[PDB]
Amino acid sequence: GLEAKKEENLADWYSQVITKSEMIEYHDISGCYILRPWAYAIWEAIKDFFDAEIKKLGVENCYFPMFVSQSALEKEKTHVADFAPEVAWVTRSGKTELAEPIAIRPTSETVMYPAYAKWVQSHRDLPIKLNQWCNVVRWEFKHPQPFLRTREFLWQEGHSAFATMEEAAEEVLQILDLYAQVYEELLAIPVVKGRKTEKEKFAGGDYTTTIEAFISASGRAIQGGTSHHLGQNFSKMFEIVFEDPKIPGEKQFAYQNSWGLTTRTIGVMTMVHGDNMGLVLPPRVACVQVVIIPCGNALSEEDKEALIAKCNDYRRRLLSVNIRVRADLRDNYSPGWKFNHWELKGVPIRLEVGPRDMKSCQFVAVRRDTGEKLTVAENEAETKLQAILEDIQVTLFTRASEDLKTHMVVANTMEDFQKILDSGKIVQIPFCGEIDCEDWIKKTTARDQDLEPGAPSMGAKSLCIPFKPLCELQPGAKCVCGKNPAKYYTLFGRSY
């Protein structure tokens, strides 16, 4: 069973659902967490979808070394300046020291692009579309939260290089739309497509696109993924040059993109869909979609091998119709134990089979998201359970998206922007775009915060500039700072 309440102490609710669903085990190194098979299967389900899609775009999988030299890491000046204090350095091999300290990748820009330069000698070498599934290390000192904020995490990073800027800009939106599919269609989480501000953009690129999700339990938003257009800032430092047949002599630099998505996906899935009973898995990423457990001392041993065979009969039928099913035929656990054990893990459907239900050619089907039981005939298991599982996926998303539509509004002044901020909601406001003004928003929001006992206050930072804002910017509408005119509607709010 679960003890902590989600509506009150969300932090303790989160630490108990990730451990009692057997997803996360803690490690003696702070910030590093063990991804148990239950959580890792979700990442592999995300991997199977995203891998099959980038290959359609012409992207191939590879693996680059995790260690970066000093000179290679410092070629891009501003890119290394943002990641510098967050880089873990290897300075000794056992007892003997290293002649040159090597760095662990916080990202593989400075690792791949020296190789991109050698691979690009003419126009026939482009485009290059490479992706890798690996781990990276960012030793940020902020308080770590499993899945969401970890010193080491798993991700994919795709790095593409084009001779054209139109080809590169086209890929940025293509990948970001795939990221939205990962959250909306696999995790049943609505996201807001948008562009990062100049303060929050990827240091070293021209612009950064992103998807932002909302967690109503804490009133905080979180970035689900990013797709950057690096322009030529890396091609001009790493000399990824080529000769154009139309214009010769002038050394042309390649246009590059970089896009990443991490295991944070699993943490957002926990915060959005989880309840006070435990985890709640979307059926499209659930390791097992339907769990089968026999229900119901003096019973003869002949009929004991009969109902477990119907369980194996159900398990085998669902596998032919492509439904991930587990048969919990373990006898050392009580039926009530495995009841809470599997809804703590969040399996979308629990299949119950009592002795009387078996003889009556029927079985019970309990839903995880709502708890509704349904006595189903034994000839309806393949077509109806598939219809129930798909109904789980849509209601989790329609509830989460109705939860987001309610919690995302518009405000045109600090009085409204701050008031609705204390309402545990995010809000799009007219923004001038200046960086120092964005610091002023994050300052006067934590300064004038109307909080409640139990919830700390943090300044509202920028999240994204939505491609499709709620309402259009009025002609001549000034920014909320008053000292500068507004350039666009910008989504703000407290963030993870």
Place this chain on the structure above:
Amino acid sequence: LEAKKEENLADWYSQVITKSEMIEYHDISGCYILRPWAYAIWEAIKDFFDAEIKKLGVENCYFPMFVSQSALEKEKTHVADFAPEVAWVTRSGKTELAEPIAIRPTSETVMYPAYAKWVQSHRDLPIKLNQWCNVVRWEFKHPQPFLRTREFLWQEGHSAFATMEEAAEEVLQILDLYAQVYEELLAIPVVKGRKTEKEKFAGGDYTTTIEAFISASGRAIQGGTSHHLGQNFSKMFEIVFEDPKIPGEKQFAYQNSWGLTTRTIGVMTMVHGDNMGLVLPPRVACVQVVIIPCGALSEEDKEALIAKCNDYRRRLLSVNIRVRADLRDNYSPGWKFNHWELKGVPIRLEVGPRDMKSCQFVAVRRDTGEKLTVAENEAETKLQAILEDIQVTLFTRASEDLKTHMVVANTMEDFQKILDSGKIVQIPFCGEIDCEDWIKKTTAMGAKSLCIPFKPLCELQPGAKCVCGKNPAKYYTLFGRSY
């Protein structure tokens, strides 16, 4: 290809891995880039091995890469052999950590503390976990791509059982899977054997392994290991369960561990690769067949055989034949031939205006080079039979080189004559550690102990002593200089 294998295979190796677009070099010694052509071979190995172990009940996971210093030295024998190879993190940016952090050379010390918490009763075992990850063993010896790298990819399965023969059963069936990976997939016959006290995994009781042989180098190479750790780790990591019968009798858990690294790709190139580029076995071939148009180019008729090109591709993918249509108009067909030859695609399909109207095409094997013309109606049947022929020929040819280069030696004079000829030898051994260090210096290169084969070449009669002449021989051990 430029260099030659028989002459300088070390430069032939560097030539074939880069021209095949498998390996790219990095400004940090020992670290190499796995380009898509090399990574696909590792994925083919991964898809097979992950599917075979899932039948055994082991689940995939991912454990942290950073191991604390208290957890590292909690097993004194394990840290004794790995400490000089452990790369240590000491600073975050420029703020130095109060306690240094170690990168995993293996995950025994990372996982087993968590095993102790997951084992509270008898119902918690067996625990079977595996992870696909990178690993770092910072060694200052001569690096060589795939074979000897400071960083490499692998899988590592860590199982914990209640009885010893439950763990003993898994050690042999995982080792048999590693044999399938090398023989059934990579067409590399190996010898199943056991380790010596000096060579066994520091922290275990006995170590099983498969050893491969590289003919053009005369040196053997460890292809994989499946250890039986016993109760050594569980006693120092308190992974225990209560005795079900007698009360208060705390019992240590029996553990295993097994690994398989990207060295598989390097042994594949060292064994099968010739002097015309790479040679890929069709089972692990990313691109099995490749179709290239050939052959006053009538644009209307030119649009007719490129459709005949895509016709074969649509026919072959229906029979699960992996094929890419190399129809790039910015490169000559002769360039495409040498491009896919250096990559080692097993079969290459050619179609010109003459044979397209003749309803036929030629298919040349990568291993042999036989340009055999075949009919159009009998394509999928023939192309499949030739792909299987490549897999079995490369297998029988590599085993012919194995049996020829795997000989038996009784005394010390014959052992040194056949070892310096570029072959491995099975010598009588007393099992002592210092005798293995002596035979290493008698012929020094220097020969190291490879494996104690489960199936020796010849039986040992009671009476023959070891090569040192002092102690009797308990078993005949395969020896030779390693990598």
